[PDB]
Design a protein around this ligand. Structure first.
Ligand SMILES: [Cl-]
Ligand SMILES: [Cl-]
Length: 162
């Protein structure tokens, strides 16, 4: 189990523009296209992203290309963030996967808002951080995925995904 297989389970794969759980225009493996209500703004963003006329539809390969960028971008974002980088540095390999997951889903800004939880992860107080992260809009909105991520932080294993 790796970060890619993990995100592919949580995000799924869709070759046609679709709306995410929040209502936003998305495609591929969780690649948010626009927060705009316009299916037209989305179709436009999409062609700018792929470099061709897609007419809201892309190939598997294109979806994987977007996915590799997004994971890379998330990883570099964590390493560039003064709030995130120390947490990351401090964790084992599996737990690190859990934080990339949150970042990919919610943006560096959002994860950075979990101050208390991040502090507990840093202190390796696993159970407490799990209890605290559950008190969030994140968890109430997408509970099954949140639970999976939270278990990964609590235990340090890939259990929730197997
Ligand atoms: Cl709450
Ligand atoms: Cl969910």
């Amino acid at each position: 189990m790796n970060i890619f297989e993990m995100l592919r389970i949580d995000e799924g794969l869709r070759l046609k523009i679709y709306k995410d759980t929040e209502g936003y225009y998305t495609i591929g493996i969780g690649h948010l296209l626009t927060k705009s209500p316009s299916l037209n703004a989305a179709k436009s963003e999409l062609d700018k992203a792929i470099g061709r006329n897609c007419n809201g539809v892309i190939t598997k390969d294109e979806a994987e290309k977007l996915f590799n960028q997004d994971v890379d971008a998330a990883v570099r974002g964590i390493l560039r963030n003064a709030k995130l980088k120390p947490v990351y540095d401090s964790l084992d390999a599996v737990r690190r996967c859990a934080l990339i997951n949150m970042v990919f889903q919610m943006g560096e800004t959002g994860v950075a808002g979990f101050t208390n939880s991040l502090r507990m992860l840093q202190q390796k107080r696993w159970d407490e951080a799990a209890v605290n992260a559950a008190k969030s809009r994140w968890y109430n909105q997408t509970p099954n995925r949140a639970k999976r991520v939270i278990t990964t932080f609590r235990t340090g294993t890939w259990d929730a995904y197997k």
